[PDB]
mmCIF file of C-alpha atoms and ligand atoms in Angstrom:
data_model
loop_
_atom_site.group_PDB
_atom_site.id
_atom_site.type_symbol
_atom_site.label_atom_id
_atom_site.label_comp_id
_atom_site.label_asym_id
_atom_site.label_seq_id
_atom_site.Cartn_x
_atom_site.Cartn_y
_atom_site.Cartn_z
ATOM 1 C CA UNK A 1 115.024 103.357 116.289
ATOM 2 C CA UNK A 2 114.111 100.213 114.353
ATOM 3 C CA UNK A 3 110.694 98.961 115.149
ATOM 4 C CA UNK A 4 109.544 95.242 115.141
ATOM 5 C CA UNK A 5 108.233 95.634 111.453
ATOM 6 C CA UNK A 6 111.655 96.965 110.287
ATOM 7 C CA UNK A 7 110.444 100.596 109.998
ATOM 8 C CA UNK A 8 113.062 103.190 111.314
ATOM 9 C CA UNK A 9 111.441 106.103 113.227
ATOM 10 C CA UNK A 10 113.280 109.158 114.936
ATOM 11 C CA UNK A 11 111.487 108.532 118.261
ATOM 12 C CA UNK A 12 110.996 105.065 119.419
ATOM 13 C CA UNK A 13 107.763 105.911 121.256
ATOM 14 C CA UNK A 14 106.346 105.844 117.728
ATOM 15 C CA UNK A 15 106.889 101.960 117.324
ATOM 16 C CA UNK A 16 103.698 101.341 119.220
ATOM 17 C CA UNK A 17 101.692 103.073 116.471
ATOM 18 C CA UNK A 18 102.664 100.665 113.688
ATOM 19 C CA UNK A 19 100.074 97.966 114.550
ATOM 20 C CA UNK A 20 97.399 100.573 114.764
ATOM 21 C CA UNK A 21 98.277 101.830 111.160
ATOM 22 C CA UNK A 22 98.134 98.218 109.998
ATOM 23 C CA UNK A 23 94.848 97.541 111.588
ATOM 24 C CA UNK A 24 93.469 100.744 110.076
ATOM 25 C CA UNK A 25 94.618 99.808 106.596
ATOM 26 C CA UNK A 26 93.760 96.303 106.528
ATOM 27 C CA UNK A 27 90.648 96.177 108.593
ATOM 28 C CA UNK A 28 89.073 99.483 108.616
ATOM 29 C CA UNK A 29 89.607 100.932 105.228
ATOM 30 C CA UNK A 30 90.543 97.697 103.704
ATOM 31 C CA UNK A 31 93.026 99.307 101.309
ATOM 32 C CA UNK A 32 90.205 101.446 99.648
ATOM 33 C CA UNK A 33 89.344 104.917 99.276
ATOM 34 C CA UNK A 34 85.727 104.204 100.140
ATOM 35 C CA UNK A 35 83.034 104.875 102.820
ATOM 36 C CA UNK A 36 85.390 104.229 105.789
ATOM 37 C CA UNK A 37 88.293 106.309 104.545
ATOM 38 C CA UNK A 38 85.861 109.254 103.857
ATOM 39 C CA UNK A 39 84.339 108.983 107.480
ATOM 40 C CA UNK A 40 87.846 109.042 109.007
ATOM 41 C CA UNK A 41 88.758 112.072 107.016
ATOM 42 C CA UNK A 42 85.477 114.132 108.080
ATOM 43 C CA UNK A 43 86.160 112.990 111.691
ATOM 44 C CA UNK A 44 89.386 114.994 111.611
ATOM 45 C CA UNK A 45 87.546 118.386 110.807
ATOM 46 C CA UNK A 46 84.604 117.804 113.090
ATOM 47 C CA UNK A 47 87.220 117.026 115.978
ATOM 48 C CA UNK A 48 89.818 119.722 115.379
ATOM 49 C CA UNK A 49 87.872 122.787 113.999
ATOM 50 C CA UNK A 50 85.558 122.698 117.168
ATOM 51 C CA UNK A 51 87.924 125.503 119.084
ATOM 52 C CA UNK A 52 87.335 129.191 119.288
ATOM 53 C CA UNK A 53 89.617 131.929 120.802
ATOM 54 C CA UNK A 54 86.543 133.412 122.545
ATOM 55 C CA UNK A 55 84.054 130.594 122.752
ATOM 56 C CA UNK A 56 86.371 127.646 123.796
ATOM 57 C CA UNK A 57 86.663 124.123 122.777
ATOM 58 C CA UNK A 58 89.902 122.146 122.895
ATOM 59 C CA UNK A 59 90.458 121.457 119.057
ATOM 60 C CA UNK A 60 92.274 118.409 118.026
ATOM 61 C CA UNK A 61 91.501 116.561 121.446
ATOM 62 C CA UNK A 62 89.448 113.587 120.637
ATOM 63 C CA UNK A 63 86.326 115.463 122.187
ATOM 64 C CA UNK A 64 84.040 114.409 119.380
ATOM 65 C CA UNK A 65 84.699 110.755 120.400
ATOM 66 C CA UNK A 66 85.084 110.976 124.167
ATOM 67 C CA UNK A 67 82.112 113.478 124.572
ATOM 68 C CA UNK A 68 80.082 112.287 121.723
ATOM 69 C CA UNK A 69 76.858 111.989 124.026
ATOM 70 C CA UNK A 70 77.072 115.905 124.014
ATOM 71 C CA UNK A 71 78.683 116.859 120.611
ATOM 72 C CA UNK A 72 76.286 114.268 118.638
ATOM 73 C CA UNK A 73 73.591 116.553 119.745
ATOM 74 C CA UNK A 74 74.860 119.383 117.610
ATOM 75 C CA UNK A 75 73.267 119.840 114.282
ATOM 76 C CA UNK A 76 76.508 120.385 112.379
ATOM 77 C CA UNK A 77 77.683 116.925 113.457
ATOM 78 C CA UNK A 78 74.831 115.121 111.601
ATOM 79 C CA UNK A 79 76.241 111.912 110.368
ATOM 80 C CA UNK A 80 79.014 111.708 112.723
ATOM 81 C CA UNK A 81 77.307 109.049 114.793
ATOM 82 C CA UNK A 82 77.427 106.657 111.600
ATOM 83 C CA UNK A 83 81.176 107.541 111.182
ATOM 84 C CA UNK A 84 81.812 106.650 115.015
ATOM 85 C CA UNK A 85 79.928 103.453 114.547
ATOM 86 C CA UNK A 86 82.670 102.339 111.948
ATOM 87 C CA UNK A 87 85.745 104.101 113.459
ATOM 88 C CA UNK A 88 84.912 104.091 117.211
ATOM 89 C CA UNK A 89 85.578 100.464 117.720
ATOM 90 C CA UNK A 90 89.224 101.080 116.301
ATOM 91 C CA UNK A 91 89.702 104.019 118.357
ATOM 92 C CA UNK A 92 88.732 102.058 121.595
ATOM 93 C CA UNK A 93 90.826 99.041 120.679
ATOM 94 C CA UNK A 94 93.827 101.241 120.417
ATOM 95 C CA UNK A 95 93.286 103.444 123.348
ATOM 96 C CA UNK A 96 95.962 101.665 125.338
ATOM 97 C CA UNK A 97 98.741 103.158 123.054
ATOM 98 C CA UNK A 98 97.298 106.754 122.109
ATOM 99 C CA UNK A 99 94.913 109.301 123.089
ATOM 100 C CA UNK A 100 91.809 109.864 121.159
ATOM 101 C CA UNK A 101 92.790 113.106 119.697
ATOM 102 C CA UNK A 102 96.000 111.373 118.333
ATOM 103 C CA UNK A 103 94.003 108.431 117.071
ATOM 104 C CA UNK A 104 91.514 110.668 114.918
ATOM 105 C CA UNK A 105 94.555 112.521 113.466
ATOM 106 C CA UNK A 106 96.356 109.230 112.820
ATOM 107 C CA UNK A 107 93.193 107.640 111.060
ATOM 108 C CA UNK A 108 92.634 110.817 108.917
ATOM 109 C CA UNK A 109 96.343 110.680 107.835
ATOM 110 C CA UNK A 110 96.178 106.891 107.045
ATOM 111 C CA UNK A 111 92.861 107.492 105.285
ATOM 112 C CA UNK A 112 94.460 109.780 102.729
ATOM 113 C CA UNK A 113 97.110 107.252 101.865
ATOM 114 C CA UNK A 114 94.190 104.950 100.626
ATOM 115 C CA UNK A 115 93.269 107.420 97.805
ATOM 116 C CA UNK A 116 95.027 107.763 94.521
ATOM 117 C CA UNK A 117 96.815 111.421 94.446
ATOM 118 C CA UNK A 118 96.436 112.218 98.109
ATOM 119 C CA UNK A 119 99.307 113.506 100.080
ATOM 120 C CA UNK A 120 101.146 111.681 102.786
ATOM 121 C CA UNK A 121 100.666 114.135 105.581
ATOM 122 C CA UNK A 122 103.031 114.641 108.595
ATOM 123 C CA UNK A 123 101.880 113.280 111.812
ATOM 124 C CA UNK A 124 102.574 114.083 115.409
ATOM 125 C CA UNK A 125 101.622 112.264 118.598
ATOM 126 C CA UNK A 126 101.216 113.525 122.190
ATOM 127 C CA UNK A 127 97.740 115.380 122.306
ATOM 128 C CA UNK A 128 96.471 115.086 125.896
ATOM 129 C CA UNK A 129 92.987 113.478 126.649
ATOM 130 C CA UNK A 130 90.114 116.125 126.278
ATOM 131 C CA UNK A 131 88.797 118.200 129.029
ATOM 132 C CA UNK A 132 85.202 118.820 127.927
ATOM 133 C CA UNK A 133 82.797 118.768 124.883
ATOM 134 C CA UNK A 134 83.256 121.453 122.420
ATOM 135 C CA UNK A 135 80.696 124.215 122.536
ATOM 136 C CA UNK A 136 78.067 124.107 119.895
ATOM 137 C CA UNK A 137 78.181 126.282 116.836
ATOM 138 C CA UNK A 138 81.989 125.690 116.186
ATOM 139 C CA UNK A 139 81.566 123.457 113.165
ATOM 140 C CA UNK A 140 80.830 125.240 110.099
ATOM 141 C CA UNK A 141 77.410 124.366 108.313
ATOM 142 C CA UNK A 142 77.009 124.122 104.561
ATOM 143 C CA UNK A 143 74.603 126.953 104.831
ATOM 144 C CA UNK A 144 77.058 129.283 106.331
ATOM 145 C CA UNK A 145 78.236 132.356 104.389
ATOM 146 C CA UNK A 146 81.737 132.620 102.851
ATOM 147 C CA UNK A 147 82.393 135.568 105.335
ATOM 148 C CA UNK A 148 81.370 133.332 108.274
ATOM 149 C CA UNK A 149 83.619 130.563 106.951
ATOM 150 C CA UNK A 150 86.535 132.627 106.408
ATOM 151 C CA UNK A 151 86.176 134.215 109.927
ATOM 152 C CA UNK A 152 86.062 130.823 111.506
ATOM 153 C CA UNK A 153 89.142 129.370 109.606
ATOM 154 C CA UNK A 154 91.165 132.726 109.612
ATOM 155 C CA UNK A 155 90.757 133.218 113.204
ATOM 156 C CA UNK A 156 92.220 129.663 113.855
ATOM 157 C CA UNK A 157 95.383 130.644 111.821
ATOM 158 C CA UNK A 158 94.420 129.303 108.226
ATOM 159 C CA UNK A 159 95.101 131.416 105.160
ATOM 160 C CA UNK A 160 92.428 131.681 102.427
ATOM 161 C CA UNK A 161 94.522 129.575 100.283
ATOM 162 C CA UNK A 162 94.641 126.748 102.976
ATOM 163 C CA UNK A 163 90.935 127.125 103.708
ATOM 164 C CA UNK A 164 89.862 126.656 100.097
ATOM 165 C CA UNK A 165 92.396 123.723 99.399
ATOM 166 C CA UNK A 166 91.268 121.647 102.692
ATOM 167 C CA UNK A 167 87.554 121.982 102.141
ATOM 168 C CA UNK A 168 87.535 121.559 98.305
ATOM 169 C CA UNK A 169 90.243 118.874 98.291
ATOM 170 C CA UNK A 170 88.470 116.900 101.129
ATOM 171 C CA UNK A 171 85.336 117.122 98.953
ATOM 172 C CA UNK A 172 87.194 115.390 96.035
ATOM 173 C CA UNK A 173 86.928 112.174 98.020
ATOM 174 C CA UNK A 174 83.693 112.432 99.851
ATOM 175 C CA UNK A 175 79.997 111.993 99.734
ATOM 176 C CA UNK A 176 76.708 113.050 101.598
ATOM 177 C CA UNK A 177 74.703 110.501 103.694
ATOM 178 C CA UNK A 178 72.347 113.143 105.228
ATOM 179 C CA UNK A 179 71.858 115.850 102.499
ATOM 180 C CA UNK A 180 69.860 113.929 99.656
ATOM 181 C CA UNK A 181 66.562 112.873 101.354
ATOM 182 C CA UNK A 182 66.727 109.066 101.982
ATOM 183 C CA UNK A 183 69.953 108.600 99.952
ATOM 184 C CA UNK A 184 73.500 107.730 100.966
ATOM 185 C CA UNK A 185 76.811 107.802 99.538
ATOM 186 C CA UNK A 186 75.917 110.569 97.123
ATOM 187 C CA UNK A 187 79.345 112.189 95.954
ATOM 188 C CA UNK A 188 80.466 115.655 95.730
ATOM 189 C CA UNK A 189 82.502 115.203 92.624
ATOM 190 C CA UNK A 190 82.622 112.563 89.617
ATOM 191 C CA UNK A 191 85.489 110.698 91.392
ATOM 192 C CA UNK A 192 85.066 110.279 95.103
ATOM 193 C CA UNK A 193 87.846 107.457 95.201
ATOM 194 C CA UNK A 194 90.370 109.977 93.520
ATOM 195 C CA UNK A 195 92.074 112.901 95.028
ATOM 196 C CA UNK A 196 91.844 114.986 91.902
ATOM 197 C CA UNK A 197 90.625 118.473 91.043
ATOM 198 C CA UNK A 198 87.183 117.299 89.521
ATOM 199 C CA UNK A 199 85.507 118.798 92.426
ATOM 200 C CA UNK A 200 86.793 122.270 91.660
ATOM 201 C CA UNK A 201 85.519 121.828 88.009
ATOM 202 C CA UNK A 202 82.173 120.385 89.016
ATOM 203 C CA UNK A 203 81.225 123.082 91.402
ATOM 204 C CA UNK A 204 81.936 125.886 88.866
ATOM 205 C CA UNK A 205 79.557 124.533 86.420
ATOM 206 C CA UNK A 206 75.941 126.041 86.423
ATOM 207 C CA UNK A 207 73.842 123.828 88.591
ATOM 208 C CA UNK A 208 70.697 122.523 86.851
ATOM 209 C CA UNK A 209 69.175 119.782 89.097
ATOM 210 C CA UNK A 210 68.776 118.370 92.619
ATOM 211 C CA UNK A 211 69.255 114.734 93.192
ATOM 212 C CA UNK A 212 66.309 112.786 94.945
ATOM 213 C CA UNK A 213 62.895 114.376 96.024
ATOM 214 C CA UNK A 214 63.834 117.643 97.704
ATOM 215 C CA UNK A 215 66.585 119.447 99.457
ATOM 216 C CA UNK A 216 68.203 119.960 102.794
ATOM 217 C CA UNK A 217 69.334 123.380 104.193
ATOM 218 C CA UNK A 218 72.760 124.001 102.745
ATOM 219 C CA UNK A 219 72.313 122.126 99.443
ATOM 220 C CA UNK A 220 72.143 123.799 96.053
ATOM 221 C CA UNK A 221 71.699 122.605 92.446
ATOM 222 C CA UNK A 222 74.635 120.495 90.770
ATOM 223 C CA UNK A 223 75.460 120.074 87.196
ATOM 224 C CA UNK A 224 76.292 116.343 87.033
ATOM 225 C CA UNK A 225 73.724 113.667 87.660
ATOM 226 C CA UNK A 226 74.228 111.471 90.673
ATOM 227 C CA UNK A 227 76.140 114.186 92.633
ATOM 228 C CA UNK A 228 75.317 116.704 95.084
ATOM 229 C CA UNK A 229 76.480 120.345 95.779
ATOM 230 C CA UNK A 230 76.860 122.226 98.947
ATOM 231 C CA UNK A 231 75.921 125.820 99.167
ATOM 232 C CA UNK A 232 79.246 126.459 100.846
ATOM 233 C CA UNK A 233 81.227 125.006 98.129
ATOM 234 C CA UNK A 234 79.075 126.758 95.582
ATOM 235 C CA UNK A 235 79.572 130.175 97.383
ATOM 236 C CA UNK A 236 83.379 129.645 97.689
ATOM 237 C CA UNK A 237 84.013 128.845 94.065
ATOM 238 C CA UNK A 238 82.021 132.229 93.207
ATOM 239 C CA UNK A 239 82.850 134.726 96.095
ATOM 240 C CA UNK A 240 85.563 137.464 95.231
ATOM 241 C CA UNK A 241 87.466 136.621 98.202
ATOM 242 C CA UNK A 242 88.034 132.937 97.103
ATOM 243 C CA UNK A 243 87.014 132.446 93.479
ATOM 244 C CA UNK A 244 90.394 133.009 92.225
ATOM 245 C CA UNK A 245 91.915 130.515 94.662
ATOM 246 C CA UNK A 246 89.097 127.961 93.666
ATOM 247 C CA UNK A 247 90.006 128.426 90.058
ATOM 248 C CA UNK A 248 93.762 128.025 90.904
ATOM 249 C CA UNK A 249 93.333 124.490 91.725
ATOM 250 C CA UNK A 250 91.662 123.438 88.689
ATOM 251 C CA UNK A 251 93.932 120.941 86.627
ATOM 252 C CA UNK A 252 96.660 121.667 89.400
ATOM 253 C CA UNK A 253 96.494 118.476 91.213
ATOM 254 C CA UNK A 254 99.960 118.566 92.610
ATOM 255 C CA UNK A 255 99.595 122.301 93.813
ATOM 256 C CA UNK A 256 96.233 121.390 95.383
ATOM 257 C CA UNK A 257 97.662 118.235 97.210
ATOM 258 C CA UNK A 258 100.560 120.213 98.625
ATOM 259 C CA UNK A 259 98.578 123.032 99.959
ATOM 260 C CA UNK A 260 95.979 120.578 101.284
ATOM 261 C CA UNK A 261 98.753 118.378 103.097
ATOM 262 C CA UNK A 262 99.943 121.313 104.928
ATOM 263 C CA UNK A 263 96.384 122.502 105.762
ATOM 264 C CA UNK A 264 95.582 119.226 107.315
ATOM 265 C CA UNK A 265 98.672 119.224 109.383
ATOM 266 C CA UNK A 266 97.781 122.609 110.746
ATOM 267 C CA UNK A 267 94.352 121.430 111.450
ATOM 268 C CA UNK A 268 95.882 118.425 113.396
ATOM 269 C CA UNK A 269 97.480 120.878 115.800
ATOM 270 C CA UNK A 270 94.488 123.091 116.665
ATOM 271 C CA UNK A 271 94.394 123.668 120.397
ATOM 272 C CA UNK A 272 97.769 122.146 120.925
ATOM 273 C CA UNK A 273 101.308 123.364 121.387
ATOM 274 C CA UNK A 274 103.594 121.997 118.707
ATOM 275 C CA UNK A 275 106.536 121.957 121.362
ATOM 276 C CA UNK A 276 104.993 119.112 123.527
ATOM 277 C CA UNK A 277 104.290 116.946 120.530
ATOM 278 C CA UNK A 278 106.466 114.137 119.000
ATOM 279 C CA UNK A 279 106.991 113.727 115.214
ATOM 280 C CA UNK A 280 105.976 110.190 114.158
ATOM 281 C CA UNK A 281 105.574 110.782 110.362
ATOM 282 C CA UNK A 282 107.472 107.823 109.575
ATOM 283 C CA UNK A 283 104.471 105.521 110.506
ATOM 284 C CA UNK A 284 102.194 106.932 107.817
ATOM 285 C CA UNK A 285 101.814 104.635 104.677
ATOM 286 C CA UNK A 286 103.221 105.552 101.237
ATOM 287 C CA UNK A 287 101.098 107.812 99.172
ATOM 288 C CA UNK A 288 99.395 106.426 96.156
ATOM 289 C CA UNK A 289 100.903 108.613 93.109
ATOM 290 C CA UNK A 290 98.304 110.460 91.022
ATOM 291 C CA UNK A 291 98.013 108.450 88.030
ATOM 292 C CA UNK A 292 95.100 110.143 86.276
ATOM 293 C CA UNK A 293 95.254 112.661 83.342
ATOM 294 C CA UNK A 294 94.345 116.171 83.256
ATOM 295 C CA UNK A 295 91.036 117.668 84.586
ATOM 296 C CA UNK A 296 88.078 117.557 82.185
ATOM 297 C CA UNK A 297 84.697 118.906 81.947
ATOM 298 C CA UNK A 298 81.936 116.331 82.571
ATOM 299 C CA UNK A 299 80.193 114.687 79.519
ATOM 300 C CA UNK A 300 77.969 116.921 77.622
ATOM 301 C CA UNK A 301 79.350 120.132 79.412
ATOM 302 C CA UNK A 302 81.259 122.771 77.736
ATOM 303 C CA UNK A 303 83.003 125.980 78.671
ATOM 304 C CA UNK A 304 79.890 128.051 78.204
ATOM 305 C CA UNK A 305 78.432 126.007 81.087
ATOM 306 C CA UNK A 306 81.179 127.313 83.489
ATOM 307 C CA UNK A 307 79.995 130.257 85.653
ATOM 308 C CA UNK A 308 83.211 132.535 85.438
ATOM 309 C CA UNK A 309 83.758 134.166 88.925
ATOM 310 C CA UNK A 310 87.624 134.631 89.050
ATOM 311 C CA UNK A 311 88.105 138.332 87.346
ATOM 312 C CA UNK A 312 91.908 137.759 87.144
ATOM 313 C CA UNK A 313 92.147 134.931 84.622
ATOM 314 C CA UNK A 314 89.559 132.931 82.436
ATOM 315 C CA UNK A 315 88.686 129.377 83.606
ATOM 316 C CA UNK A 316 91.137 126.893 82.027
ATOM 317 C CA UNK A 317 90.369 125.652 78.653
ATOM 318 C CA UNK A 318 89.607 122.014 79.564
ATOM 319 C CA UNK A 319 88.521 119.192 77.477
ATOM 320 C CA UNK A 320 85.046 117.551 77.647
ATOM 321 C CA UNK A 321 85.119 113.970 78.806
ATOM 322 C CA UNK A 322 83.668 111.966 75.743
ATOM 323 C CA UNK A 323 80.482 110.105 75.553
ATOM 324 C CA UNK A 324 76.953 110.517 76.774
ATOM 325 C CA UNK A 325 75.832 112.088 80.096
ATOM 326 C CA UNK A 326 75.808 109.280 82.832
ATOM 327 C CA UNK A 327 75.006 109.271 86.642
ATOM 328 C CA UNK A 328 77.802 109.205 88.921
ATOM 329 C CA UNK A 329 77.809 105.953 90.999
ATOM 330 C CA UNK A 330 76.913 106.230 94.594
ATOM 331 C CA UNK A 331 79.608 105.331 97.052
ATOM 332 C CA UNK A 332 79.169 101.629 98.220
HETATM 333 C C1 HEM B 401 83.050 125.125 105.447
HETATM 334 C C2 HEM B 401 83.517 123.857 105.633
HETATM 335 C C3 HEM B 401 83.095 122.560 105.570
HETATM 336 C C4 HEM B 401 81.531 122.325 105.217
HETATM 337 C C5 HEM B 401 80.425 123.322 105.625
HETATM 338 C C6 HEM B 401 81.403 120.876 105.273
HETATM 339 C C7 HEM B 401 80.106 120.264 104.879
HETATM 340 C C8 HEM B 401 79.959 118.887 104.670
HETATM 341 C C9 HEM B 401 78.825 118.304 104.582
HETATM 342 C C10 HEM B 401 77.286 118.823 104.762
HETATM 343 C C11 HEM B 401 78.958 116.889 104.250
HETATM 344 C C12 HEM B 401 77.817 115.782 104.095
HETATM 345 C C13 HEM B 401 77.751 115.212 105.473
HETATM 346 C C14 HEM B 401 76.555 114.159 105.657
HETATM 347 O O1 HEM B 401 75.677 114.169 104.787
HETATM 348 O O2 HEM B 401 76.291 113.689 106.786
HETATM 349 C C15 HEM B 401 80.472 116.864 104.241
HETATM 350 C C16 HEM B 401 81.132 115.573 103.960
HETATM 351 C C17 HEM B 401 82.527 115.453 104.142
HETATM 352 N N1 HEM B 401 83.572 116.364 104.562
HETATM 353 FE FE1 HEM B 401 83.097 118.374 104.560
HETATM 354 N N2 HEM B 401 82.677 120.320 105.121
HETATM 355 C C18 HEM B 401 83.482 121.323 105.354
HETATM 356 C C19 HEM B 401 84.942 121.101 105.413
HETATM 357 C C20 HEM B 401 85.551 119.900 105.348
HETATM 358 C C21 HEM B 401 86.901 119.707 105.806
HETATM 359 C C22 HEM B 401 87.926 120.627 106.149
HETATM 360 C C23 HEM B 401 87.139 118.225 105.684
HETATM 361 C C24 HEM B 401 88.405 117.664 106.147
HETATM 362 C C25 HEM B 401 89.411 117.977 106.666
HETATM 363 C C26 HEM B 401 85.870 117.777 105.239
HETATM 364 C C27 HEM B 401 85.786 116.348 104.852
HETATM 365 C C28 HEM B 401 84.495 115.787 104.514
HETATM 366 C C29 HEM B 401 84.446 114.353 104.114
HETATM 367 C C30 HEM B 401 85.607 113.358 103.923
HETATM 368 C C31 HEM B 401 83.148 114.151 103.959
HETATM 369 C C32 HEM B 401 82.492 112.895 103.596
HETATM 370 C C33 HEM B 401 82.120 111.903 104.524
HETATM 371 C C34 HEM B 401 81.598 110.569 103.967
HETATM 372 O O3 HEM B 401 81.474 110.106 102.886
HETATM 373 O O4 HEM B 401 81.325 109.954 105.079
HETATM 374 N N3 HEM B 401 85.014 118.704 105.126
HETATM 375 N N4 HEM B 401 81.089 117.930 104.532
HETATM 376 CA CA1 CA B 402 87.455 118.396 119.569
HETATM 377 CA CA1 CA B 403 87.660 113.328 93.286
#
């Protein structure tokens, strides 16, 4: 079917989503891989992962928006109130054509296309409205152990490879608003507007510093001024179950993107039955091709500053970016 805009879709029910995509790209994200895009991506996880085989929760069901009055009382959802302040008006204005679970997955898929190197993910619609708030304690916290993290993701059907890709990859285009005391927009990697593998390098370095005037539980030292490091990422890069996976993504942007895209799509289906959904992948914007060079070590860092954790292979011999140590700019 040809939509009013000229887009051909396999299922004509998808045509009603085209204005939603345009609104998100023009008016929420403003064509940028910035604060709004980051929020929409994070919302995908906080909505979808909140499901357990034994404790309940509906997964990718829109509960985090509909039942925000409950789910925003959960510690793991710190900062989601601010995300919903930005995204929530768009969810409401487009609630005539799609359910909230569908909207959240759409917005995350569209967010990625705003970012250099991020994959164009598949997208399906047809998730029913949510029945209830997720239980508490289903969203992983940055102070959770690797074993805890792998149990949560693994029990939901993710491989370890997918788990590392989807966490690390997301943190390549991300910052913290609630970790560095009284500071917002503090990136996890040197390039929060680029979907590159700098996050993988940055986290493998020995940490030497904390930003700001104190820590929050689940934060550890970072190696690069103007960034922050989560304990969870720190441990995932160093634990024997995940460290070879973590290292495998360094300077492998295409591989990382492909795995990430597969993982996001899997995440999008949590709590759903793929049978009763409709493919609407044609509505997702074109991806922005990765246009940056190889991964590098940050200025002033050398291979002796890498904490080797993968026993199978040495850390790739990357170049060091030229020039003086500089503080990474905060995300506007
Ligand atoms: C063990 C798993 C994970 C943990 C513990 C974790 C933890 C965090 C924390 C603590 C923050 C900063 C939040 C704030 O300061 O308010 C954050 C930001 C973010 N996370 Fe993760 N995360 C995980 C997995 C993921 C996944 C799977 C995705 C995407 C599907 C994701 C996407 C993001 C994004 C995009 C941001 C930045 C938000 C912004 O700049 O507004 N995270 N994460
Ligand atoms: Ca949910
Ligand atoms: Ca990056």
